[PDB]
């Protein structure tokens, strides 16, 4: 099963920069969301879940089809609350009806990271909307109450190795958990609408206490008011994961480069790019454009 990237007819770099700018201007404008965190975090969370359904064994799921628009996938328990990022992006799709849904969902993620001061993420167009019966079943996204063995095995379904898994998890510097969504409650650190290596620093530097939350699930809580999921805590339990955690705590530039490659890879899994496809785009930030 092959999905071949097909560029939206007659569109080029500057067309997608416009779509970037509209997302970015709206990000600026809707700052009150989730007690003033803004929609940045939920946008990267949406891009990760629409990509996270991929199965490298048969190329089912993945970002290409844009299948999150169908009710079986948006009703996935693993996706509770993500309807807020979808709603955010509705005005944008309306303004640019020519872009595909998978292109827009993935670009929203890229846009969020860059505007939150993270690294440039190269992004490629050409995902094409596929029909409702291509929507993958629920249950492909990962559980939080597991250990490093689980985590390692999970991400291998996405063709990700140890380094990629630890870089990717650094996105938990952003936003927070919400009891009503997931059964976990609280943020991972203090600067949660700015992309930094804080997740790794907090993981190593705080005084974590294992507790049961108000939904009766176990999570790691610090005196600072931070939390870690068991899967997060895994990363300092496995000695291979811990070595890389130390690395990124110690070197944010290294973390930014590895996150950048890994996030692009996640959003492009399952997509075959023609030799003559355009080169990956690197979008300018609003700030870089004077907007
Ligand atoms: C073993 C894998 C992971 C687990 C179990 C996991 C689990 C969680 C949970 C339970 C939430 C809270 C949901 C809520 O209550 O709203 C969450 C949110 C979030 N996750 Fe992950 N996740 C994982 C990996 C990732 C990765 C790969 C990304 C992205 C590169 C990511 C991005 C984030 C973001 C930014 C948030 C905040 C969303 C917002 O604030 O609403 N996650 N995740």
- Measured from the CB, is residue 45 less than 6 Å from ligand 1? yes
Question: Resolution of the deposited coordinates, in angstroms?
Answer: 1.9
- Measured from the CB, is residue 177 less than 6 Å from ligand 1? yes
- Residue 94 Cα distances to 86, 101, 104, 260, angstroms: 12, 11, 11, 29
Residue 44 Cα to ligand 1 middle (Å): 9
- Measured from the CB, is residue 44 less than 6 Å from ligand 1? yes
Residue 233 Cα to ligand 1 middle (Å): 14
- Measured from the CB, is residue 183 less than 6 Å from ligand 1? no
- Residue 183 CA: nearest ligand 1 atom is 15
Our mutation pick for probing the ligand 1 site, out of 171, 194, 233, counting the most ligand atoms within 8 A of Cβ, is 171
Residue 144 Cα to ligand 1 middle (Å): 9
Please report the domains of the chain, with CATH numbers, ordered by start residue.
1-141+263-291 (1.10.520.10), 142-262 (1.10.420.10)
- 3 marked ligand binding residue: no
User: Which residue's CA is minimally distant from atom 21 of ligand 1?
Assistant: 172
């Amino acid at each position: 099963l092959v999905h071949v990237a097909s560029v939206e007819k007659g569109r080029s770099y500057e067309d997608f920069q416009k779509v970037y700018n509209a997302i970015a201007l709206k990000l600026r404008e809707d700052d009150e969301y989730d007690n003033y965190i803004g929609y940045g975090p939920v946008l990267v969370a949406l891009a990760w879940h629409i990509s996270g359904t991929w199965d490298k064994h048969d190329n089912t799921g993945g970002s290409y089809g844009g299948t999150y628009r169908f009710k079986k996938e948006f009703n996935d328990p693993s996706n509770a609350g993500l309807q807020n990022g979808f709603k955010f992006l509705e005005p944008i799709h309306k303004e640019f009806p020519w872009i595909s849904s998978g292109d827009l969902f993935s670009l929203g993620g890229v846009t969020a990271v860059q505007e939150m001061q993270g690294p440039k993420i190269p992004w490629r167009c050409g995902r094409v909307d596929t029909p409702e019966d291509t929507t993958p079943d629920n249950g492909r996204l990962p559980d939080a109450d597991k250990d490093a063995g689980y985590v390692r095995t999970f991400f291998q379904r996405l063709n990700m190795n140890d380094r990629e898994v630890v870089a990717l998890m650094g996105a938990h510097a952003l936003g927070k958990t919400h009891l009503k969504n997931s059964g976990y409650e609280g943020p991972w650190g203090a600067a949660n609408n700015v992309f930094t290596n804080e997740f790794y620093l907090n993981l190593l530097n705080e005084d974590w206490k294992l507790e049961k939350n108000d939904a009766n699930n176990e999570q790691w809580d610090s005196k600072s008011g931070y939390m870690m999921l068991p899967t997060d805590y895994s990363l300092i339990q496995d000695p291979k994961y811990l070595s890389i955690v130390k690395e990124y705590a110690n070197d944010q530039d290294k973390f930014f480069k590895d996150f950048s490659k890994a996030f692009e890879k996640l959003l492009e899994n399952g997509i075959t790019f023609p030799k003559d496809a355009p080169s990956p785009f690197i979008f300018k930030t609003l700030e870089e454009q004077g907007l």
